[PDB]
Amino acid sequence: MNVPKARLLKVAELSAKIFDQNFNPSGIRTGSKILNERLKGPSVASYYGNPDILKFRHLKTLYPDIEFVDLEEQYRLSMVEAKKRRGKGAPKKMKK
Template sequence: MAAFVPPSRLRALTQLRCSIFQTSYNPESLRTGAKYLRARLRGPSMVGYYPATFNIPEIIRKYPELEMVDDEEQERLQDVIDRRRRGKGAPKKAKSKADSRRLQKRR
């Protein structure tokens, strides 16, 4: 027949075991998140998974001797010129306070 061990002794034994093996003592079985804190970090492997970005404007600036043309930038500049011709471009900056649009308004 097995000997009866009081629960207080088992609790003390568990607490001592946790202090010896450096584990957390959690008698109420509360959620602590220890599983996620012990897990391996995902960030470094995710960064290694995706290749480095291919940036055409950066390559053009770095190697001007290649004489490459960025089509998207050329198209953007042409769109800006077209908008200015139609009067849809950005307004001119005021050189002085007298040129400001606020002062031209009537009150």
């Protein structure tokens, strides 16, 4: 490396001049670790809580004539009714 460091830094600055390059000769924290953070952010939103489904039921504002049956819901209702009948249902919520 028989080359003046000043010239070397000048070249680095020249690259900083050519390709939009951050020149940090000082080496002082520029927060660039954050400035360079251009990675995907709503990645979690892309999946997980992606909102766009027709929760079973949904079906009754568009297709009206058809009398559909949600089976799991019906079963649950039947179970609730059975519980009510045999005294094993559920005490009322204090409306406080």
